[PDB]
Amino acid sequence: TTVNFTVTGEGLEYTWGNHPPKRVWAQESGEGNPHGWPHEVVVYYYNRYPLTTIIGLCTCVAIIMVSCVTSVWLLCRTRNLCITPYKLAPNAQVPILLALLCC
Amino acid sequence: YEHTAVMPNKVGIPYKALVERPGYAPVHLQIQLVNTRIIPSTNLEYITCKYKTKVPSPVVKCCGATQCTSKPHPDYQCQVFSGVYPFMYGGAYCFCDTENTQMSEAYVERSEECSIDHAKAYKVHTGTVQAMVNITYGSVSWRSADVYVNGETPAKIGDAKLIIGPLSSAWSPFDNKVVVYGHEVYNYDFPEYGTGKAGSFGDLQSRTSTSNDLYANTNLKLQRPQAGIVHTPFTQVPSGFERWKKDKGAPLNDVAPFGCSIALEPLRAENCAVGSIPISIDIPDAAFTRISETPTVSDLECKITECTYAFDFGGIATVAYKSSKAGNCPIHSPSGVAVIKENDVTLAESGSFTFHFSTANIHPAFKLQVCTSAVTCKGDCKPPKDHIVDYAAQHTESFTSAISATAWSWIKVLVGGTSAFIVLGLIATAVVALVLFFHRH
Amino acid sequence: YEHTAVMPNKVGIPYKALVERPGYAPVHLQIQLVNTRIIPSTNLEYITCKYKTKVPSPVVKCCGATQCTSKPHPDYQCQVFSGVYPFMYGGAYCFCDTENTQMSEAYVERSEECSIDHAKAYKVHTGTVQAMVNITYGSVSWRSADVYVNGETPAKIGDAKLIIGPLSSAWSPFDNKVVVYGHEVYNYDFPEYGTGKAGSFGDLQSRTSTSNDLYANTNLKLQRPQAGIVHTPFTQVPSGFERWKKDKGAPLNDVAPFGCSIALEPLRAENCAVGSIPISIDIPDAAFTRISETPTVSDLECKITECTYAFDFGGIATVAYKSSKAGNCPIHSPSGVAVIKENDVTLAESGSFTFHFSTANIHPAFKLQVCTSAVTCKGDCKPPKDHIVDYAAQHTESFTSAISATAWSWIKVLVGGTSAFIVLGLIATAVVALVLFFHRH
Ligand SMILES: *[C@@H]1O[C@H](CO)[C@@H](O)[C@H](O)[C@H]1NC(C)=O
Ligand SMILES: *[C@@H]1O[C@H](CO)[C@@H](O)[C@H](O)[C@H]1NC(C)=O
Ligand SMILES: *[C@@H]1O[C@H](CO)[C@@H](O)[C@H](O)[C@H]1NC(C)=O
């Protein structure tokens, strides 16, 4: 039979009937390239830290979405306040700087 | 000079430090644990083994009757079987056909094998912790002594007095009650003396292997002798000790966490890598040399020529230096990023020397304390090629050990970009508020 | 028949109960503890005793010099005193006037008294609890045996199987460290082996009284011999054991709570009146007689003729009765209001009998069971005349035991009147509130 055991950096001890116990440890030799493109970087950390990488990426996406939504809302709200004083004044000058930064 | 520190509770991994005495050159200190033994206090509760059924000769009363009596024998059984008409080689033993009586007796006693093949039931309480420590300092060769890890009892190891603090963790693999059989220890909650059940572990219990008061709980029932046969038949539940041997399962020796090794003389758990161990060692005054009497190193330049964050000493570095007096110089790395293989180097007036180190970091950065001086070494380490190794890691991994420069770059960009985008929104909101204010005023 | 109950952890006070087996007349059961022993598990840490200073003959080197060498002796001291010119009975020992040296040597040993006059330092861990139980039931005389107070190990006492539950309180008078000297036990956090200070309890520490490795920590210092005298003077800190024996203080034997009595063989605390003890006794089926085979008692009338709530059996009562099949009948009071002195009485076809009881209640009201029947006894009890007695109380005092009928009457008047005042005020408020409502409508 073929038996596969998971070995971590802590080590694994196995004893085969009447043989002395043997101890082995796993090195951090996972696949990937942490110095390459995002594809290779994520692959390396996923193989080395499966759960932490998944949690990390999900947390980053949540922070990005919350930050982008908040900033887009803040800018949309700001733009309305900037242009509303002129939208209600059909003959207003509408300064060129405001026309470029707000309109 | 007393040097105090905290070393990890690891066997075979040496603790290295530089003993820095004001006004004297640093003395390299290396403390290594050879073994660590947790020796609990044990009280033998009783001894269990396979029972023997002793059956004295039956009493055959011809043309009459007899009566059984009570005796102190363990699990003693006595029954009077009337109407027996036994026959032997010489013919009918009794004259009467149905008026004869046979009395059978039987009792349980320890078997001969119980002298050797028996299980000891022990109650385990917190005991003591001892260790074998190998120490070398300065030019003194390796010396070792057996010490008590109490944090108070000092030990003299090569003119140095060592005090080892108690283990940071009170963890022990032994449960409150254990059963020792042969070389194996079982965390088995054995029944108390006098409550063992027939066909179970405690069916037979004895306070000692020589005790005269034996407890035996087997459903020993005397059967009626067969027609015309003089014998003492009986039924009894198979021994619960032999049944236990088949179902005893995995011993503590094979399931104890932290790689503990179990020994029986005395009962103890060895090399349990749990927590850390405080240490306090007094280095003799004669071991220190005045600073003015040792070499002075300057213009240290450290170049990492090759690095792999393998469990072995996969890193190689070259340090260029200039030194006066061209003497010997201790080498050390106080940062946990890398563990240095060499303890000291021989220095010339000028040149370079190489040292080996083991590091878990993909981009190691550590301070190398060249005697009385220091040099910062930085480099890039490649991943190890061997998937499985038969030796423990010589280094310590940290939370950020695996974070590469590219990983930090992306983290900084994501954190900085989102933060900058938030600030842009807040600033624009505040600026427009001022624009509206000026509209009214 | 198994009878289960809970008895207080009291020594010398018998527990009485009626074993009521359906279909059989009650069997009186009385269980009394003769002694209770808490026997902890102890590990000898080291033995301390008065030290002896051994001083070998000094080496007097005339016209020359000698050198001291280290030796494996406890607190070994060696010093060479140059410039000596000793004199003996036969004149000047050395020829040279100052080119002579005397080498003084001294070391610490266990004194001869240490075999008998020494203190044993022990580590104390939870051990076992045992008791001597005295039991009588029905017509069976008092029988006793040693039992284990663990709730598991059964004991055979006079054909009855007794299981004594564990003490409800795990309290023990011994701390984790105790010192045993002579017959006295001291709760003393003695220093760890190898840590005893000079002139203190642990100045001299030995793992056992016959060991060949002795720890000695005394300021043993060799002084220069007086001019012209061959002798080995020395100064040393006076024995910390002799000091300790002066300042031992009060032993545990004199400060243990709950009246514990400390014994040493084995170390134990006896008769500690802590908590209660669950019990279970299986009474033989032969001890029970069918209801129809025992006397029937009726028309019971109990009159208290005298009563004082003294610690002794201060109460006396007379019970009139009518019966049939004159014979013995057990007497018992199931409630804690009164403890009956007599266990059984002889009943005729008619008459009366008397019994004595102990009660703490000023107005005792308790049920008396006369085998298959029961009667209620009521009366008044006078205060006891003796201020101090040399025996423990047989009864138990309850919260309401001291409240007299007069005190209850005042409490009833207080609460009834106080409540009526508020009740009347609230009713008057409600009545006026309704009238005001009807005024508007
Ligand atoms: C073990 O892994 C090998 C491939 O590495 C596979 O062929 C085999 O079936 C596995 N066996 C078990 C028990 O997982
Ligand atoms: C101490 O270390 C040295 C070298 O590492 C070794 O030769 C010696 O046997 C060690 N001592 C013990 C007790 O193992
Ligand atoms: C048990 O109690 C009876 C009566 O109190 C007494 O005669 C007997 O000696 C007691 N048993 C022991 C062991 O003291």
mmCIF file of C-alpha atoms in Angstrom, chain B residues 63-218:
data_model
loop_
_atom_site.group_PDB
_atom_site.id
_atom_site.type_symbol
_atom_site.label_atom_id
_atom_site.label_comp_id
_atom_site.label_asym_id
_atom_site.label_seq_id
_atom_site.Cartn_x
_atom_site.Cartn_y
_atom_site.Cartn_z
ATOM 1 C CA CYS B 63 -23.392 -42.273 51.934
ATOM 2 C CA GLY B 64 -23.628 -38.894 53.628
ATOM 3 C CA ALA B 65 -23.413 -35.139 53.202
ATOM 4 C CA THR B 66 -21.012 -32.271 53.887
ATOM 5 C CA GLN B 67 -21.386 -28.500 54.258
ATOM 6 C CA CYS B 68 -19.402 -25.668 52.693
ATOM 7 C CA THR B 69 -17.709 -23.016 54.822
ATOM 8 C CA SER B 70 -16.631 -19.445 54.116
ATOM 9 C CA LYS B 71 -12.924 -18.749 53.604
ATOM 10 C CA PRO B 72 -10.950 -15.541 52.926
ATOM 11 C CA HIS B 73 -9.604 -16.817 49.586
ATOM 12 C CA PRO B 74 -10.238 -14.275 46.780
ATOM 13 C CA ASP B 75 -13.420 -15.043 44.836
ATOM 14 C CA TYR B 76 -13.737 -18.214 46.894
ATOM 15 C CA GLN B 77 -16.441 -20.608 45.683
ATOM 16 C CA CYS B 78 -17.802 -23.668 47.477
ATOM 17 C CA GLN B 79 -20.783 -25.796 46.486
ATOM 18 C CA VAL B 80 -22.059 -29.173 47.681
ATOM 19 C CA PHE B 81 -23.257 -31.468 44.869
ATOM 20 C CA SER B 82 -25.512 -34.230 46.207
ATOM 21 C CA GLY B 83 -26.399 -37.451 44.422
ATOM 22 C CA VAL B 84 -22.943 -38.053 42.941
ATOM 23 C CA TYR B 85 -21.880 -41.619 42.098
ATOM 24 C CA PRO B 86 -18.268 -41.197 40.948
ATOM 25 C CA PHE B 87 -16.247 -43.990 39.360
ATOM 26 C CA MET B 88 -12.466 -44.308 39.281
ATOM 27 C CA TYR B 89 -9.899 -46.762 37.909
ATOM 28 C CA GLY B 90 -10.831 -49.086 40.778
ATOM 29 C CA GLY B 91 -14.558 -48.874 40.036
ATOM 30 C CA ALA B 92 -17.362 -47.174 41.914
ATOM 31 C CA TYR B 93 -15.852 -44.961 44.600
ATOM 32 C CA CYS B 94 -18.968 -44.954 46.821
ATOM 33 C CA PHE B 95 -21.331 -47.723 47.910
ATOM 34 C CA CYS B 96 -24.587 -45.741 47.926
ATOM 35 C CA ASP B 97 -26.079 -44.728 44.572
ATOM 36 C CA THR B 98 -27.712 -41.379 45.411
ATOM 37 C CA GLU B 99 -26.690 -40.750 49.044
ATOM 38 C CA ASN B 100 -23.106 -39.657 48.237
ATOM 39 C CA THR B 101 -21.931 -36.039 48.210
ATOM 40 C CA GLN B 102 -19.101 -34.239 46.381
ATOM 41 C CA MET B 103 -17.899 -30.840 47.628
ATOM 42 C CA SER B 104 -15.997 -28.655 45.142
ATOM 43 C CA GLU B 105 -13.797 -25.678 46.045
ATOM 44 C CA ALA B 106 -12.156 -23.058 43.841
ATOM 45 C CA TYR B 107 -10.485 -19.681 44.292
ATOM 46 C CA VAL B 108 -8.549 -17.059 42.316
ATOM 47 C CA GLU B 109 -4.839 -16.358 42.847
ATOM 48 C CA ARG B 110 -2.121 -14.510 40.934
ATOM 49 C CA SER B 111 -0.493 -16.520 38.154
ATOM 50 C CA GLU B 112 3.260 -17.119 37.992
ATOM 51 C CA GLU B 113 3.448 -14.762 34.995
ATOM 52 C CA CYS B 114 2.205 -11.976 37.281
ATOM 53 C CA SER B 115 5.765 -11.775 38.635
ATOM 54 C CA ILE B 116 6.919 -10.478 35.220
ATOM 55 C CA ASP B 117 3.892 -9.907 32.933
ATOM 56 C CA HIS B 118 1.660 -7.433 34.768
ATOM 57 C CA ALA B 119 0.448 -3.841 34.461
ATOM 58 C CA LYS B 120 1.159 -1.188 37.097
ATOM 59 C CA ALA B 121 -1.598 1.346 37.799
ATOM 60 C CA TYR B 122 -0.092 4.681 38.870
ATOM 61 C CA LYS B 123 -1.460 8.011 40.053
ATOM 62 C CA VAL B 124 0.630 10.846 38.606
ATOM 63 C CA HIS B 125 1.235 14.196 40.310
ATOM 64 C CA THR B 126 3.411 17.154 39.381
ATOM 65 C CA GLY B 127 7.021 16.206 40.052
ATOM 66 C CA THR B 128 10.358 17.659 38.961
ATOM 67 C CA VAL B 129 12.056 18.676 35.715
ATOM 68 C CA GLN B 130 15.702 17.860 35.002
ATOM 69 C CA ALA B 131 17.964 18.405 32.015
ATOM 70 C CA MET B 132 21.445 17.648 30.704
ATOM 71 C CA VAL B 133 23.150 20.856 29.555
ATOM 72 C CA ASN B 134 26.279 21.130 27.398
ATOM 73 C CA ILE B 135 28.109 24.445 27.840
ATOM 74 C CA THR B 136 31.195 26.017 26.271
ATOM 75 C CA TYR B 137 32.348 29.606 26.746
ATOM 76 C CA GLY B 138 35.347 31.533 25.473
ATOM 77 C CA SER B 139 38.315 29.176 25.158
ATOM 78 C CA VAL B 140 36.840 26.597 27.560
ATOM 79 C CA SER B 141 35.964 23.313 25.868
ATOM 80 C CA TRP B 142 32.502 21.771 26.040
ATOM 81 C CA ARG B 143 31.458 20.802 29.567
ATOM 82 C CA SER B 144 28.181 19.250 30.682
ATOM 83 C CA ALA B 145 26.337 18.418 33.889
ATOM 84 C CA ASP B 146 22.911 17.190 34.937
ATOM 85 C CA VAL B 147 20.857 20.069 36.344
ATOM 86 C CA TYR B 148 17.467 20.613 37.965
ATOM 87 C CA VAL B 149 15.248 23.033 36.062
ATOM 88 C CA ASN B 150 13.955 24.778 39.195
ATOM 89 C CA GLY B 151 15.258 28.309 38.641
ATOM 90 C CA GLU B 152 16.931 28.275 42.073
ATOM 91 C CA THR B 153 19.268 25.272 42.364
ATOM 92 C CA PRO B 154 22.676 26.217 40.895
ATOM 93 C CA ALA B 155 24.974 23.796 39.100
ATOM 94 C CA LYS B 156 28.745 24.047 38.651
ATOM 95 C CA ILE B 157 29.678 23.416 35.004
ATOM 96 C CA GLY B 158 33.368 24.032 34.341
ATOM 97 C CA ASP B 159 33.813 26.780 36.969
ATOM 98 C CA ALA B 160 30.579 28.396 35.713
ATOM 99 C CA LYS B 161 27.458 28.363 37.884
ATOM 100 C CA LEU B 162 24.253 27.786 35.912
ATOM 101 C CA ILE B 163 20.709 28.411 37.158
ATOM 102 C CA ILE B 164 17.901 27.392 34.793
ATOM 103 C CA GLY B 165 14.463 28.899 35.310
ATOM 104 C CA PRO B 166 11.346 26.736 35.372
ATOM 105 C CA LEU B 167 9.796 25.859 32.041
ATOM 106 C CA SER B 168 7.417 28.543 30.805
ATOM 107 C CA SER B 169 4.746 25.840 30.356
ATOM 108 C CA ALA B 170 3.582 23.430 33.063
ATOM 109 C CA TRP B 171 2.349 21.017 30.380
ATOM 110 C CA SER B 172 3.056 17.312 30.917
ATOM 111 C CA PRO B 173 1.922 14.383 28.734
ATOM 112 C CA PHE B 174 0.931 12.194 31.696
ATOM 113 C CA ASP B 175 -2.684 12.299 32.850
ATOM 114 C CA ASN B 176 -3.756 12.119 36.490
ATOM 115 C CA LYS B 177 -3.901 8.310 36.188
ATOM 116 C CA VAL B 178 -1.673 6.166 33.966
ATOM 117 C CA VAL B 179 -1.107 2.446 33.426
ATOM 118 C CA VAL B 180 2.452 1.247 32.771
ATOM 119 C CA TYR B 181 2.786 -2.065 30.917
ATOM 120 C CA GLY B 182 6.171 -3.277 29.750
ATOM 121 C CA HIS B 183 7.895 -0.274 28.194
ATOM 122 C CA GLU B 184 4.577 1.424 27.325
ATOM 123 C CA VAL B 185 2.610 4.033 29.278
ATOM 124 C CA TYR B 186 -1.147 4.431 28.811
ATOM 125 C CA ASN B 187 -3.297 7.368 29.917
ATOM 126 C CA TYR B 188 -5.912 4.858 31.048
ATOM 127 C CA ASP B 189 -8.496 5.866 33.665
ATOM 128 C CA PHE B 190 -8.311 2.574 35.519
ATOM 129 C CA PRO B 191 -10.995 1.644 38.070
ATOM 130 C CA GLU B 192 -10.208 2.177 41.723
ATOM 131 C CA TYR B 193 -9.074 -0.739 43.856
ATOM 132 C CA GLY B 194 -11.981 -2.991 44.780
ATOM 133 C CA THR B 195 -14.271 -1.867 41.932
ATOM 134 C CA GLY B 196 -12.838 -3.820 38.997
ATOM 135 C CA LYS B 197 -15.363 -5.749 36.928
ATOM 136 C CA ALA B 198 -15.213 -9.292 35.584
ATOM 137 C CA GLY B 199 -13.642 -9.461 32.147
ATOM 138 C CA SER B 200 -12.312 -5.897 32.419
ATOM 139 C CA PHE B 201 -8.902 -4.408 33.148
ATOM 140 C CA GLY B 202 -9.340 -4.380 36.921
ATOM 141 C CA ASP B 203 -10.888 -7.839 37.286
ATOM 142 C CA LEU B 204 -7.850 -8.806 39.397
ATOM 143 C CA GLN B 205 -6.176 -6.132 41.518
ATOM 144 C CA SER B 206 -3.287 -6.355 43.979
ATOM 145 C CA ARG B 207 -1.701 -3.508 45.925
ATOM 146 C CA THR B 208 1.735 -5.039 45.279
ATOM 147 C CA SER B 209 3.171 -7.951 43.329
ATOM 148 C CA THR B 210 3.734 -9.705 46.684
ATOM 149 C CA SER B 211 0.582 -8.584 48.521
ATOM 150 C CA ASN B 212 -1.307 -11.302 50.390
ATOM 151 C CA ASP B 213 -4.681 -9.532 49.951
ATOM 152 C CA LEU B 214 -5.792 -10.101 46.351
ATOM 153 C CA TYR B 215 -9.009 -8.667 44.937
ATOM 154 C CA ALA B 216 -10.564 -10.851 42.231
ATOM 155 C CA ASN B 217 -13.924 -10.217 40.541
ATOM 156 C CA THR B 218 -14.746 -13.008 38.084
#
